[PDB]
Design a protein around this motif. Structure first.
Motif, PDB file in Angstrom:
ATOM      1  N   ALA A  70     -25.587  -5.729 -25.846  1.00 52.13           N
ATOM      2  CA  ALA A  70     -24.962  -5.320 -27.096  1.00 52.13           C
ATOM      3  C   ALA A  70     -24.919  -3.810 -27.267  1.00 52.13           C
ATOM      4  O   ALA A  70     -24.017  -3.303 -27.937  1.00 52.13           O
ATOM      5  N   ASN A  71     -25.870  -3.083 -26.682  1.00 55.44           N
ATOM      6  CA  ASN A  71     -25.931  -1.635 -26.820  1.00 55.44           C
ATOM      7  C   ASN A  71     -25.212  -0.913 -25.690  1.00 55.44           C
ATOM      8  O   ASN A  71     -25.329   0.311 -25.580  1.00 55.44           O
ATOM      9  N   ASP A  72     -24.457  -1.636 -24.868  1.00 55.32           N
ATOM     10  CA  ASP A  72     -23.658  -1.043 -23.807  1.00 55.32           C
ATOM     11  C   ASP A  72     -22.210  -0.877 -24.263  1.00 55.32           C
ATOM     12  O   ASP A  72     -21.782  -1.500 -25.235  1.00 55.32           O
ATOM     13  N   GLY A  81     -24.470   4.777 -13.178  1.00 58.50           N
ATOM     14  CA  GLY A  81     -25.289   4.041 -14.124  1.00 58.50           C
ATOM     15  C   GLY A  81     -26.250   3.074 -13.463  1.00 58.50           C
ATOM     16  O   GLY A  81     -26.107   1.860 -13.599  1.00 58.50           O
ATOM     17  N   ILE A  82     -27.233   3.622 -12.746  1.00 66.58           N
ATOM     18  CA  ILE A  82     -28.227   2.784 -12.076  1.00 66.58           C
ATOM     19  C   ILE A  82     -29.143   2.127 -13.102  1.00 66.58           C
ATOM     20  O   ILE A  82     -29.633   1.012 -12.896  1.00 66.58           O
ATOM     21  N   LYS A  83     -29.373   2.801 -14.227  1.00 71.93           N
ATOM     22  CA  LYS A  83     -30.070   2.223 -15.379  1.00 71.93           C
ATOM     23  C   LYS A  83     -31.217   1.316 -14.923  1.00 71.93           C
ATOM     24  O   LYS A  83     -31.273   0.122 -15.221  1.00 71.93           O
ATOM     25  N   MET A  84     -32.135   1.925 -14.177  1.00 69.80           N
ATOM     26  CA  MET A  84     -33.352   1.237 -13.765  1.00 69.80           C
ATOM     27  C   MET A  84     -34.272   1.055 -14.968  1.00 69.80           C
ATOM     28  O   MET A  84     -34.935   2.003 -15.399  1.00 69.80           O
ATOM     29  N   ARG A 144     -33.595  -1.665  -9.410  1.00 68.41           N
ATOM     30  CA  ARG A 144     -34.311  -0.674  -8.602  1.00 68.41           C
ATOM     31  C   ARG A 144     -34.048  -0.847  -7.106  1.00 68.41           C
ATOM     32  O   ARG A 144     -34.705  -0.221  -6.272  1.00 68.41           O
ATOM     33  N   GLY A 145     -33.080  -1.680  -6.747  1.00 67.79           N
ATOM     34  CA  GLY A 145     -32.657  -1.795  -5.372  1.00 67.79           C
ATOM     35  C   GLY A 145     -31.540  -0.818  -5.085  1.00 67.79           C
ATOM     36  O   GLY A 145     -31.104  -0.081  -5.967  1.00 67.79           O
ATOM     37  N   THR A 152     -18.298  -1.097 -25.064  1.00 68.08           N
ATOM     38  CA  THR A 152     -17.487  -2.279 -25.316  1.00 68.08           C
ATOM     39  C   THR A 152     -16.283  -2.382 -24.399  1.00 68.08           C
ATOM     40  O   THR A 152     -15.659  -3.447 -24.331  1.00 68.08           O
ATOM     41  N   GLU A 165     -29.605  -3.980 -32.121  1.00 71.08           N
ATOM     42  CA  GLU A 165     -30.178  -3.942 -30.783  1.00 71.08           C
ATOM     43  C   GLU A 165     -31.097  -2.746 -30.592  1.00 71.08           C
ATOM     44  O   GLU A 165     -31.951  -2.762 -29.702  1.00 71.08           O
ATOM     45  N   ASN A 212     -25.483  -4.307 -13.673  1.00 74.02           N
ATOM     46  CA  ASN A 212     -25.010  -4.052 -15.020  1.00 74.02           C
ATOM     47  C   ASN A 212     -23.554  -4.480 -15.152  1.00 74.02           C
ATOM     48  O   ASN A 212     -22.945  -5.006 -14.217  1.00 74.02           O
ATOM     49  N   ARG A 246     -17.025  -4.334 -21.175  1.00 74.99           N
ATOM     50  CA  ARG A 246     -17.207  -5.762 -21.398  1.00 74.99           C
ATOM     51  C   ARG A 246     -15.984  -6.573 -21.004  1.00 74.99           C
ATOM     52  O   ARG A 246     -16.061  -7.804 -20.970  1.00 74.99           O
ATOM     53  N   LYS A 262     -22.985  -1.925 -11.133  1.00 68.06           N
ATOM     54  CA  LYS A 262     -24.022  -1.117 -10.520  1.00 68.06           C
ATOM     55  C   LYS A 262     -25.353  -1.852 -10.567  1.00 68.06           C
ATOM     56  O   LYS A 262     -25.615  -2.619 -11.498  1.00 68.06           O
ATOM     57  N   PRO A 263     -26.218  -1.642  -9.575  1.00 72.58           N
ATOM     58  CA  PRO A 263     -27.537  -2.294  -9.588  1.00 72.58           C
ATOM     59  C   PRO A 263     -28.428  -1.715 -10.674  1.00 72.58           C
ATOM     60  O   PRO A 263     -28.411  -0.511 -10.932  1.00 72.58           O
ATOM     61  N   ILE A 264     -29.224  -2.577 -11.291  1.00 71.99           N
ATOM     62  CA  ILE A 264     -30.239  -2.161 -12.246  1.00 71.99           C
ATOM     63  C   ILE A 264     -31.602  -2.779 -11.915  1.00 71.99           C
ATOM     64  O   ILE A 264     -32.481  -2.846 -12.769  1.00 71.99           O
ATOM     65  N   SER A 294     -24.787  -3.418 -31.994  1.00 71.83           N
ATOM     66  CA  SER A 294     -25.452  -2.262 -31.413  1.00 71.83           C
ATOM     67  C   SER A 294     -26.418  -1.608 -32.386  1.00 71.83           C
ATOM     68  O   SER A 294     -27.358  -0.935 -31.952  1.00 71.83           O
TER      69      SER A 294
END
Lengths: 212, 161, 600, 459, 109, 459
Positions: F217-219, A1-4, F103-104, F221, C371, F95, F224, F99-101, C368
């Motif tokens: 909120a759209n990720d 999930g890099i989700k750029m 772009r690195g 649950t 959003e 995130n 979390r 994980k990176p978000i 959700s």
């Protein structure tokens, strides 16, 4: 999930290949004779990947490996500028624009901080509103007035462009849009409004040489 | 005041009286139908055809490894043939080898117009495949058409959906 | 692709020989093809929740497995249709059967396959070109208002191998073929997207462009922005019709979606009957609203899965057009009825209940939901932009705000258009409470307002201060009778009344007041606030001694000015153009400034 | 038709309370109806609630006492519960199972309908228009019933909710500025009240247009669940297929809800809020929403569900879940009953959201809406003045207050108080309203436009 | 203090709801007494006895509104919440009972 | 390390809610992480929350929608969720799964730490004895913050608790008259909240010391309830291995509690209050207690677990259980916000359980404790005066009461009201305190000894 941003790893690089292919198509569409040398140079890093058969998949690997200009935001802005140039020349397609003006308008767009929100963009949106309506329009006084004025509007844009603000073009936009939104049932208002333009226009024969 | 109440009772009972008379007409028709089916089973070849069909339908509905057919004693010769034919037809249709026997010790009451009953091996599942039972089943399920045929369609009914 | 029914315990059907099934997959149970979903799985057996009645389902019945989870069919023909909560065309079911009932196990395709649509390719693509997800390869001409842009389905890409030539195609044909790593995909005009999945965008942008509704109140004081989320109370006497009609008729959005969740039959009839009769002027022609609208209809006796799914079906349709570059405005008629349907399913599944009996995840589902709204940069090379707004209503039992559904909603939406019934009883419309209502986009829109109108922001600040002071003075007036009261307070009270009477109040049944352009709304408020300031100064600069100005003197002195201010709402934008209306308002400004000058 | 011989099983795995668990059953259906024969020759009915493989579980309608696991036989019909319907059944009295109890014949069917039916396609639903007058002024001139709405009567236990319902059946009809029928279903009714309905309907000549279903308190509780389904199944046949207007009265929905909770327990479901099933919401909607007008047909169904409020608390799930999905309420009070006012209906807490469409020129009379609004304000004010009187006395009141006090006393005595055998049509109800309004001078009737006053106020 | 301190029950709900209705009715009846006294007071303006009656009546009305009812409403809301909490633990136990029964049945097969 | 090849299974037994049950698993390990691939190529992960014999129960983070029974492929990592950590995570945006978000690249680990962490040996834990200057008088004066202290802000939906936290991030210094590494876990929030903080951190010019974890909120649950541990795991690395002072802010902890409640219901665990797990306290302690200084090392972790109070209910399990674990709370309310008071911090129901040792001689000023305690007494009494005055009227008050009303009114606008960019010192705050205290005569300042009044009061 890099989700750029809003994209995952595969989607991000797929959108990059799409934008590059799109620019290549737009460049040939706007300048099929390759006359606009300065504009082409600004896109050489994405046009160099054109005229090669990568079956999508090999150019996609070049993006993942980092050989392509794979910055998504830089492509978004640079692609927007080029396709807005397409709208400029396409929406006035009955007329030819001078090459020096095409490059001039291009440079003014490239210098803009946020072209999408510019008056340049809005004026083109008004132009497309007026020219799309007429694509499938019945004969009637209103539509003949709008077509006659639209050909003048396209004729003038071909000569002055859009970024170079001109009161004459701006007033014609206002009159065309005001008629366009005018009730179809009302005849006297559209009759006097069109006549007002024709008699107030600085010249004597506003449509002579513009329309058949 | 009381006269109005009396008229209400008279009209309401009169409505029931004619409805009951109409229900007797239906009952009498069903009783006549039973007598006509009695006339049919008095035949030989036509009745044997009924038995061939009835035995097959029973076997197909029960789908058990063992089956026993019970019938009226006087109908045994015809049922025997019906089972002998039903067996190879059943096996082809269902691809299951079922041992189908006929009950030679217990028989259906002689007052039944005709038909058979089919039992599984342990006599715990039975198929109500007698002639009189089938007639009642069909007469009731088709009854809405009997009503119209005899007494007319409902003039106030405009949509049949 | 078939399994078998093992047993039925009510609305729950147990399947056997169904090893190849995914959770929240779709099945068509029995010979009537009943719609249901797979929830629990164990071995080669599956537990199916059937939406419709299971009466008559036998052990051994077939079950047809459908690979896609609950999904919406997206393509031409979506506009102008009324759908069930699980995407079943009600206008086709009632017309293809001649019945009045929705057949049990009815199986009508969401988009008809007998229509020959006018399809024009983009004319930019060629065989051998590269296309990615979200790209537009042709447009279908549906009607005079909305062009239906055909996008490559998300999560698809490759080289184009076939492009259909311009012509008339139906939704069952093949329009574009593309090859990715040697695998050829044949695409028609219809794409399928799981309803619980969020359609991807390039980026989620801030909402800065106002939602230009036709009401002076619910705009000047309580702005909404394209892509924003608000809540509207739904009570019988609140007058919610005004917002519904005003939003669908005159909004600056492109596409309207009206979503029912599970309302009373007669209420759904009113919506289904009213909407087709609404029209708006567009290019000078009067067009039916249904040419740029889509509607999802669910009554309280619809399958609970549909009533719960309706809210997600609507927003999925909304995003579909969002990805086209359109501005979409979706109204959920009652999100409380949705929450009721959601609680019912949680009960049906014997889940542990939480606050006031609602599922533990109520808040997560609402969060959700909202959003997903907002202004976005779309996918695909066309570099287009669009937005989805949500104006969902809340109607908690008893009208209280303690219900977790309304409490959670208010913590999510950034604008609350609090309506009231007392105002309706007083015949004051729109029925906006004012003290309860709020908008949290005031800062977000500050850039737009400064750029285009300049004076709007200080005017709305003063306007709320004047109205609030009228409320603050209420106790003083009750205990005094305006006798022992400052003349400056009398200005506040009477001017606040003027605002309530001839500005915030709007009469939508009059041809001149059907729509108030923003420039007229700010014109009306500017002159009223300018008067307020002049009246305050007239009293304050002369209130020392000897010769003072009072409110009674102002009323007697310039009664014609107070009349002209009230008359401003009658400037009909259809006959009096923008230049004429501003010209008349400028004259009032001059008349006023001179009227006060004569007092000093 | 099926024309398939029925199978009768003697294979029983066990019996557990109301349930009989069968074995080796061939391709059983859910909701299939079966018939039991006990060793004593007794026949009983039941319905299949669960089918887990070959283990079909049937709920017996009557008690399960006397049933063994060795000799009792179970005959399967191969079908579900489908009710024989006809026009002729109007004027008949049936029990919960659909059997006649009026000494008449069994219904000679015109068709068979699944009593669960189907939802009405909202695309073809027509908004309610004309009015169905009830004959009771308190609910004709104040909160009329539109021809297509669904407006419940909430009552406390002990109040005459059944006497009002019976009065509606005798008096209700069309405005009449032959196509009107009433389908009346009583769930969980005791023997004394069941006699009340049956005898009162027959004696007063109303039976010709009434289809009466009586489910007695000591009848099988599962039959109580289908009873309202049979009533609506009949209503749908009569209304939509025979082009006529049907008024459906569902009496004691609270007793239905209790029977529904029992069915949930029989399924071993975990109870929901206050002990009721989690699906009570959709179950009530399933019954309630099978009503209204449909496009292209001249028939209609209206409903007046009648609900007893447990502990007189409107918050209770039964009236709450009902009202939440119905359009307004009639609301019967207790104080009016203790004051010996009949009908005891309190107009201040009642509401009919569709009254705006029910009444007006071309449907009742021009002044209908105006008379209702003015009477409501006058009654509410009279109550307010009466409360003041209790504090300040009679001598502290002014002339206007005395007019409101006089209105209050005569309003309840002349307008609301009616009697069970006086049928007041909508036009007489409005005329009585004016008799009360003419107490006041024109200037105090603020809610009636001057045009209406000039035409109707004098004389 | 914050609550009347009646143990949560359905009986408490009935008493509190009746108590709340009584307090609200008293508030309105005393408000009407105050309004009647205020009108007579202003008309006169046996004078000081009216000023004392108004202050005493208004003080009682204010206490109902600011002290007694808020306290009844807090008590009622407390009762409702605690009763829903008891419903949940009953739900939990019944659910586990149903699952244990199913588990026993599986063992028997 | 783990040298043995990993095993991959296609042995999924079944799926029930968020839990995927595998069979035929070789030597299942408790709390091990499983990676699974769906038939369409989607990759998801989960943790084994139960093992028994050959079975294992995997809770899938992304969700169980689309999980198959025949084609699902799972592999067992062979260890617990150990995550890569490095110092250069500062300046990165992650995130909720780590994980990176931005772009690195992925994290180039310096080590792998167990997300569950370890409890700090109470014998080596060193009591906090340093004060952080927040610049907010409402805090620095009456509820001081120590370095290593746990102080959430209790707020309510719509209140500017996000602005207060943002303000604290920029103007939080020391009273020693220093660069804090901020770890901000944005969980259960909308885009605008995450963008607000992200922009503010850049606007403050401090982004080089800020590590963000986003879970919107759209990720999912389920993720979390690991994000906080991911944030804290980084904080522990930085604070206890690299001697960096870290400020860890967890956004509305109520979204954590709700995600936890969802898991509790899914696993049918014993509820406590409002449906939350009976072990909620222990789980919260696992998150909260990852804070404080450790003897012999120069690092620290300070937490601010801001949470939204459900319906402003101060007794809701979320603020209740937190209040039992953390060293007090800041607590904002609507009564201050509705009057445009910022920050809207209500001191009366608030406390700081380290203030008594972090103030006074050698820390701030010797009169600190005395000023705070007297201000609390005067503020609370002023609130009592309003509660009385609301009923008895202003005329019923005496001079002893008006002094507290004057104090209360001047207190809120002079002491509490500051503005988003007003940065006051602790010394100025106390001086302001005295300006309010000097409203009263010496005899009424009963919380302050004469050894303090005689020096400070005269000014």
């Amino acid at each position: 999930g890099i989700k750029m941003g809003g994209l995952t790893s595969e989607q991000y690089h797929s959108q990059v290949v799409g934008k590059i292919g799109y620019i290549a198509r737009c460049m040939q569409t706007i300048d099929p004779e390759n006359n606009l040398k300065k504009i082409r140079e600004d896109y050489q890093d994405v046009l160099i990947w054109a005229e090669k058969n990568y079956r999508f998949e090999e150019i996609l690997e070049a993006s993942k490996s980092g050989k392509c200009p794979n910055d998504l935001d830089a492509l978004s802005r640079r692609s927007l500028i080029l396709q807005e140039l397409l709208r400029l020349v396409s929406s006035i397609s009955p007329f030819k624009m001078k090459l020096d003006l095409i490059e001039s308008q291009y440079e003014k767009m490239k210098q803009h901080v946020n072209l999408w929100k510019s008056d340049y963009h809005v004026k083109l949106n008004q132009l497309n509103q007026l020219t799309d309506y007429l694509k499938n329009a019945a004969p009637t006084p209103k539509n003949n007035f709008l077509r006659a004025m639209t050909s003048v509007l396209q004729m003038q844009i071909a000569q002055y462009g859009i970024t170079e603000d001109n009161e004459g073009i701006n007033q014609l936009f206002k009159l065309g849009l005001h008629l366009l939104a005018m009730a179809n049932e009302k005849i006297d208002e559209q009759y006097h409004l069109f006549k007002g333009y024709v008699k107030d226009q600085p010249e004597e024969s506003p449509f002579e040489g513009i329309l058949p | 005041q009381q006269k109005k109440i009396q008229m209400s009772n008279l009209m309401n009972q009169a409505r029931l009286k004619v409805l009951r008379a109409r229900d007797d007409l239906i009952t009498d028709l069903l009783n006549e139908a039973k007598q006509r089916l009695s006339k049919v089973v008095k035949d030989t070849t036509r009745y044997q055809v009924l038995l061939d069909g009835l035995v097959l339908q029973g076997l197909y509905q029960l789908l058990e490894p063992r089956m026993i057919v019970r019938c009226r004693k006087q109908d045994f010769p015809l049922v025997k043939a019906a089972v002998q034919k039903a067996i190879p037809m059943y096996k082809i249709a269902t691809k299951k080898d079922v041992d189908v026997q006929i009950d030679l010790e217990a028989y259906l009451p002689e007052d039944i117009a005709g038909g058979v009953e089919i039992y599984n091996g342990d006599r715990k599942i039975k198929v109500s495949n007698t002639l009189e039972s089938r007639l009642d089943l069909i007469a009731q399920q088709m009854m809405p058409e009997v009503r119209g045929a005899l007494f007319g369609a409902n003039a106030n009914r405009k949509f049949l959906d | 692709t078939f399994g078998y029914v093992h047993g039925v315990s009510g609305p729950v059907v147990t399947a056997c020989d169904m090893a190849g099934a995914a959770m929240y997959e779709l099945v068509r149970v029995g010979h009537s093809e009943l719609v249901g979903e797979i929830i629990r799985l164990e071995g080669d057996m599956a537990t199916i929740q059937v939406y419709e009645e299971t009466s008559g389902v036998s052990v051994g019945d077939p079950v047809l497995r459908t690979g896609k989870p609950l999904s919406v069919e997206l393509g031409p023909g979506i506009m102008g249709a009324i759908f069930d909560g699980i995407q079943r065309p009600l206008s086709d079911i009632s017309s293809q059967t001649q019945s009045i009932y929705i057949p049990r196990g009815v199986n009508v395709s969401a988009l008809s396959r007998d229509i020959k649509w006018e399809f024009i390719p983009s004319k930019n693509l060629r065989v051998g070109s590269h296309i990615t997800g979200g790209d537009i390869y042709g447009i279908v001409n549906e009607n005079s208002l909305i062009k239906h842009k055909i996008m490559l389905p998300p999560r698809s890409r490759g080289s184009v191998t076939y492009i259909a030539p311009p012509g008339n195609y139906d939704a069952s044909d093949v329009v574009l073929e593309l090859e990715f790593e040697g695998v050829k995909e044949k695409l028609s005009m219809v794409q399928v997207w799981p309803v619980r999945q969020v359609r991807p965008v390039t980026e989620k942008l801030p909402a800065n462009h106002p939602l230009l509704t036709g009401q002076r109140v619910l705009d000047a004081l309580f702005p909404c922005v394209q892509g924003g989320t608000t809540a509207i109370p739904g009570a019988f006497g609140c007058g919610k019709t005004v917002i519904s009609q005003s939003l669908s008729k005159y909004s600056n959005s492109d596409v309207i979606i009206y979503v029912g969740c599970g309302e009373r039959g007669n209420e759904m009839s009113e919506v289904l009957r009213d909407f087709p009769e609404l029209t708006m002027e567009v290019d000078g022609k009067v067009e039916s609203i249904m040419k740029r609208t889509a509607l999802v209809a669910n009554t309280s006796n619809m399958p609970v899965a549909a009533r719960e799914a309706s809210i997600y079906t609507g927003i999925t349709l909304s995003e579909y057009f969002r990805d086209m570059g359109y501005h979409v405005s979706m109204m959920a008629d009652s999100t409380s009825r949705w929450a009721e349907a959601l609680r019912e399913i949680s009960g049906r599944l014997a889940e542990m209940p939480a606050d006031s009996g609602y599922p533990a995840y109520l808040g997560a589902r609402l969060a959700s939901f909202y959003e997903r709204a907002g202004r976005v940069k779309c996918l695909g090379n066309p570099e287009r932009e669009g937005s989805v707004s949500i104006v969902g209503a809340v109607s908690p039992p008893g009208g209280d705000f303690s219900d977790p559904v309304t409490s959670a909603t208010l913590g999510i939406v950034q604008v609350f258009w609090g309506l009231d019934k007392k105002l309706a009883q007083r015949k004051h419309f729109p029925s906006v409470n004012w003290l309860i209502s709020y908008s949290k986009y005031m800062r977000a829109l500050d850039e737009y307002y400064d750029k285009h109108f300049t004076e709007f922001v200080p005017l709305r600040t003063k306007a709320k201060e004047i109205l609030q002071e009228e409320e603050d003075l209420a106790e003083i007036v009750q205990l005094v009778g305006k006798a022992s009261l400052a003349e400056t307070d009398k200005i506040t009270l009477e001017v606040a009344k003027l605002i309530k009477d001839d500005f915030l109040q709007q009469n939508g049944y009059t041809p001149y007041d059907r729509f108030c352009p923003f420039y007229k709304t700010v014109g009306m408020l500017s002159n009223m606030i300018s008067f307020y300031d002049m009246a305050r100064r007239a009293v304050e600069t002369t209130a020392q001694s000897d010769n003072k100005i009072t409110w009674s003197i102002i009323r007697e002195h310039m009664g014609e000015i107070l009349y002209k201010l009230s008359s401003m709402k009658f400037k009909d934008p259809v006959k009096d153009g923008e230049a004429k209306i501003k010209a008349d308002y400028a004259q009032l400004l001059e008349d006023m400034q001179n009227a006060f000058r004569s007092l000093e | 038709y099926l024309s398939q011989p029925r199978l009768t099983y003697k294979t029983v795995s066990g019996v557990n309370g109301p349930l009989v668990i069968l074995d080796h059953v061939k391709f059983p259906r859910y909701a299939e109806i079966v018939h039991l024969t006990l060793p004593d020759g007794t026949k009983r009915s039941g319905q299949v609630l669960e089918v887990s493989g070959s283990k079909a579980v049937v709920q017996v309608f009557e008690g399960t006492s006397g049933i063994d696991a060795k000799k009792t036989s179970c005959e399967f019909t191969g079908d579900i519960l489908r009710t024989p319907v006809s026009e002729d059944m109007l004027g008949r009295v049936f029990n919960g199972s659909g059997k006649p109890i009026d000494r008449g014949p069994v219904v000679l069917a015109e068709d068979f309908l699944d009593i669960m039916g189907q939802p009405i396609n909202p695309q073809c639903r027509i908004y309610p228009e004309e009015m169905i007058q009830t004959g009771i002024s308190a609910i004709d001139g104040m909160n009329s019933i539109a021809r297509g709405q669904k407006i419940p009567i909430f009552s406390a236990a002990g109040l005459p909710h059944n006497e009002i319902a019976a009065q509606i059946c005798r008096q209700a009809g069309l405005v009449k500025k032959e196509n009107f029928a009433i389908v009346f279903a009583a769930m969980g009714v005791n023997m004394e009240t069941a006699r009340f309905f049956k005898s009162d309907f027959e004696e007063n000549g109303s039976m010709d247009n009434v289809c009466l279903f009586l489910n007695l308190a000591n009848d099988p509780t599962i039959e109580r669940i289908i009873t309202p389904r049979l009533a609506l199944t009949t209503a749908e046949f009569l209304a939509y297929q025979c082009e006529k207007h049907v008024l459906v009265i569902l009496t004691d929905m609270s007793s239905y809800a209790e029977a529904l909770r029992e069915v949930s327990a029989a399924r071993e479901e975990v109870p929901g809020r206050r002990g009721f099933p989690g699906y009570m919401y959709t179950d009530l909607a399933t019954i309630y929403e099978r009503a209204g007008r449909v496009e292209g047909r001249n028939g209609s169904i209206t409903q007046i569900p009648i609900l007893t409020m447990p502990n007189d608390d409107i918050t209770h799930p039964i009236p709450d879940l009902t009202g939440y999905i119905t359009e307004g309420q009639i609301y019967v009070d207790r104080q009016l009953h203790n004051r010996q006012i009949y009908p005891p209906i309190n107009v201040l807490p009642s509401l009919s959201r569709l009254m705006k469409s029910a009444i007006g020129e071309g449907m009742t009379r021009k002044d209908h809406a105006d008379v209702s609004n003015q009477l409501y304000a006058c009654y509410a004010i009279g109550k307010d003045v009466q409360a003041m009187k209790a504090v300040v006395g009679e001598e502290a009141l002014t002339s206007d207050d005395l007019l409101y006090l006089e209105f209050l006393q005569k309003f309840e005595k002349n307008f609301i108080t009616q009697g069970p055998y006086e049928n007041r049509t909508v036009y007489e109800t409005l005329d009585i309203g004016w008799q009360l309004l003419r107490i006041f001078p024109k200037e105090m009737l603020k809610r009636i436009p001057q045009s209406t006053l000039s035409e109707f106020y004098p004389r | 203090k914050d609550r009347i301190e009646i143990f949560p029950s359905r009986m408490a709900q009935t008493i509190m709801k009746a108590r709340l209705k009584g307090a609200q009715t008293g508030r309105n009846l005393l408000k009407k007494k105050s309004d009647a006294l205020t009108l007579r007071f202003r008309q006169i303006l046996s004078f000081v006895t009216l000023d004392e009656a108004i202050k005493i009546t208004n003080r009682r009305v204010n206490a109902i509104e600011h002290v007694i009812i808020p306290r009844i409403e807090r008590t009622l809301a407390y009762i409702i919440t605690e009763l829903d909490e008891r419903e949940r633990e009953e739900f939990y136990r019944l659910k586990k009972i149903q699952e244990k029964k199913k588990i026993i049945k599986e063992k028997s097969e």
